[PDB]
Symmetry: C2
Subunit: 384 residues, 2 copies
Amino acid sequence: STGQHPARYPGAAAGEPTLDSWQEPPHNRWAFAHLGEMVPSAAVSRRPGHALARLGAIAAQLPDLEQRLEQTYTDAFLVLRGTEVVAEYYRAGFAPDDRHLLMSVSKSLCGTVVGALVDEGRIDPAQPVTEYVPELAGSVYDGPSVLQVLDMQISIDYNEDYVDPASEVQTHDRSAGWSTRRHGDPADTYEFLTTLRGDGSTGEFQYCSANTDVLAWIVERVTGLRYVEALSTYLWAKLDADRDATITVDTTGFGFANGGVSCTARDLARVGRMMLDGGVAPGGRVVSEDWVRRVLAGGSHEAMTDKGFTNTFPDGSYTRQWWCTGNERGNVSGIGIHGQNLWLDPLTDSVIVKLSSWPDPYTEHWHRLQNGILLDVSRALDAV
Amino acid sequence: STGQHPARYPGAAAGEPTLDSWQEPPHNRWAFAHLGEMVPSAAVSRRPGHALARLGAIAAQLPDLEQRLEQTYTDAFLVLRGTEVVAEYYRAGFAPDDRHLLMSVSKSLCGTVVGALVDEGRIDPAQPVTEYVPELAGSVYDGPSVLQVLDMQISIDYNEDYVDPASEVQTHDRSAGWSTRRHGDPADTYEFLTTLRGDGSTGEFQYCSANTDVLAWIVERVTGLRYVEALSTYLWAKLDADRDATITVDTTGFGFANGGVSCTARDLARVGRMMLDGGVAPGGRVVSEDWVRRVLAGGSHEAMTDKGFTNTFPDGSYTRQWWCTGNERGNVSGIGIHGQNLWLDPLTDSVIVKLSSWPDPYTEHWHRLQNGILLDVSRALDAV
């Protein structure tokens, strides 16, 4: 059992509705107004072919920028300097207001929600995960603190070989509805998390998507709100965003916190703006100044043993769901497979959003190219 | 085999992507920008509890209208007189701009798209269905004309007992993704349609959702456009709608034309406005004056043998995916289970939209109450 979870709607029974009961009362009153949460759906455009390139200023310092963006399968690119959009690019077929999957950049958004609750005193990072989710007792999450989840410093037996269906990475997707279920798979994301094990060691960084979903579970237990609603109340609704964001949900309505969020490039930049504004957004304070300061400061360098990161950023680290480069510019970034970045350049008070679709989820090649672009653009923003 | 279908995206292979391949290239470039079409998803509100009742004028003639709306599980109600919204009602929990499933009102929208293509000479209603969809040869759709599909005058062995999983009605839902698939089910909606049989007789009205999906299939074969896109290009994009509409899609991306469309009440009213404006919308002509005239004129009365309709509307009929009351007011309406109506009252140049969630899909009781409200509101709009 995975314990109590926020009802899909007021008064809903556990796990209701399902794909087989949404047309039945009392579920239908809610379902008829949120069918996209139950059945895959397409948008029927209210609006009746070529790339949009407005690289403005930086175009002078980076003459071949558009070509570099094309080479890295860029779908949407936006640079926000202060409160002004100084550069934009959208591939042919992708509108400026179209939404794009964030993959793991979604994690940085989840960490933000956790930070807001820490500020309220609803979550104590020093407390064990089991203080909030007792049902995780007996799993790899039995013992570690919430902070260790936030910093991903928990050793977990999590096979990342996505070509193998038995791998934890593939099983995680199936449990969440990102892939077709196989006989024996956990019923939902919560159950999948309870199956995870490890040797018990902590302290060393191990990038694992399961950690973020555990954070989302904690958020639900502490607020009583579906993660989908918590993400809106504690973050999205305070950004004065142009459009709602979306998040995939599993069979219980649990948002795939680790990587299922989609939003426009401009709106994602508002998250970065909030971070560079000390945690304050147009609709109110999202997180404390201290939380933002801790994110920018970085995590323990010794815990960071991922050569895929340190070969490029020797003094890099990870904390509270953000990657910290530790470079001379103090760059920090949300990162997602296939080329997603919510990059912060505090020196120039700028935010760089790059949403892409590389053919591969990850290769040293793509990251070298992607980081080269983000760093060059950052430097192009420097006063001269 | 069901023949050629519009690719999910430019250059996509047949049936690609699936729930198990959307993260792979070349599918991912499209998928990352339209994930809701592959995985159930929830909206993360950009906006930070009580019913909204603005029945204005008609409130005087119908003092207990709000109570009557509550009694019929009304979610959204809107009256458009001319170009002005003269009355509105939204239940607590349902915002004025929230979208609502249309169920079979979706059929009237599909018929409109067909009408637009008839105007272009791309579809000849006198032609057999097989002229456009040869793959329907050998099925109940082998012989009947496109007009007979439009008027639903084809005898089909289609069990409507939804409590029985073997029924065509339940199998139809499973084939489309509205319910969990069972071993042996057709792979998609197209395949399901090819399994339908009948005694070969035509001429008598038989309400059957399969007919509308056959129309959508014809639309795709004649335009080369996914029905989702056709619905936008030929209708939605010309309404100057406030929001996009949405439509559920099956595993191939085929929109559930017969009943999967969702939209706001105000936007649905724009469809009615177009009908009362002779087929013209703000973005251009949607259908010909003649098409609208034929819809308002009604279908053959002798073909209409559905007592569930004629007991209330003795001179009623059905044509081109619209129900024609044949009453003294010449009322015509799009109708969907659980209380959905796109009601036209030409006498007062008004459109009445009522989107609900009755606990039951259909009962003589609910329809008596619902029609009583629509008729009373219509009369309340009369000059006095």
